[PDB]
Amino acid sequence: APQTITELCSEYRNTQIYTINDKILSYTESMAGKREMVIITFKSGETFQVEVPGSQHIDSQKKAIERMKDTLRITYLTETKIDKLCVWNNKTPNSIAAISMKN
Amino acid sequence: APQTITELCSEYRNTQIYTINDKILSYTESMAGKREMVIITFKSGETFQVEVPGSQHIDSQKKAIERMKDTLRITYLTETKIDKLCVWNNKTPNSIAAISMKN
Amino acid sequence: APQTITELCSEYRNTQIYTINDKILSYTESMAGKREMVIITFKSGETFQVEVPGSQHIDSQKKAIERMKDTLRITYLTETKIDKLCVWNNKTPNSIAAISMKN
């Protein structure tokens, strides 16, 4: 298995690493139908989503999507610095595939 | 996908944005049959609900309804300021579609 | 839907509101067979349970019973003040239907 977020991210096409090195500025959560998602922003203005679960996801990703949203909320609330995001860049806002944090 | 709670809110009929800019003043949770819901209030006097799951909701909203209640509870306990609420105004009290928090 | 805990409580038979205006004094949780329940007490001497799930509950209450136990635990741990409890008075100890918190 990969040993770093960059190694993992490189296994996928249409992805890139953002080096965030910052805490989340805003957290947005929606339960509206067909928009069941989370959006985060940083003081850089950069904005990222956890996508609504769809047919682009395999069954094993369903729990992992829910976990990713749990992680972003608690990351927001604790003011924890995010190090990198691995994101798909074929989505607007770019879509999170993985996150890393260091202290 | 939308980039902000206002953009997302505007995709739905019968909604409006409340700019709260404040922590939750009271949190109410019911496990009484047919009233399995959460109600929050603010110092300003406003009251909002997370509706009981019902036939107006689509399957994808089930998990998101539960997440929203989770979010409201930890937001309350941590005295986290809510920025905006996207609510449906055809319900009494108005019904939460989305929330945002800024730091 | 109701706007307050008292409104909600009054929709049900065999209920009453206790005004607690205090943090939980003690929290007890059991995984013992037939006694899978939570008990809370207050310095006033007042004791309440979340009932063991049973045939008196409907399916929409299953998640909500688990949520209520979750809420009592974290409310205890954080020394959060409880405003009111809606309880069923045809159980001993009285059984929690709904809870509100407010400082």
Add this chain to the structure above:
Amino acid sequence: APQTITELCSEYRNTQIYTINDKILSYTESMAGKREMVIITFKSGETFQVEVPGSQHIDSQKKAIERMKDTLRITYLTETKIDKLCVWNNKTPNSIAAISMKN
């Protein structure tokens, strides 16, 4: 239903209350197959388990076993003092049936 951990523990024939009055010293968690369990210790040296699920349990205990492990972790992390443990003392380590905490 019981109103205290003592009353509850008295309904079982191989149980014992351990008066702990202390925070958890160590927390151990395993996901190893057939050893999916939690072990806690205290400075007194006293060691306790949440048993692996099996035929010593009835179905109603399954969610409660997961809850109890959730409780021990957050109790450990928050340095929360445990008052009492009701345990089955026919197991090594003694097996947790219920927990109480007071402040």
Add this chain to the structure above:
Amino acid sequence: APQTITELCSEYRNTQIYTINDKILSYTESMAGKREMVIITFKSGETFQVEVPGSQHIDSQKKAIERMKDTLRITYLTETKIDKLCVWNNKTPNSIAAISMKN
């Protein structure tokens, strides 16, 4: 049942104890398909994973894998010191079987 992580770790082939005695340096979480996993690192240079669920896991391990990831997140966020890890050494990076914390 085992009374310590050391005893437990000894019941498995291809495992060893790592004495960590430190907080986690970095946390990585992926929801990318076929890489739904968590990676942790320490200042010692060691890297460990919670494996992607797979045919090597038995049904009783599926909730325990999710729990372990939950534990690693909150341990990271709270700067909690890890005592030992029981890991499988037939995986790269080595795969977490059990964790102990004291502190």
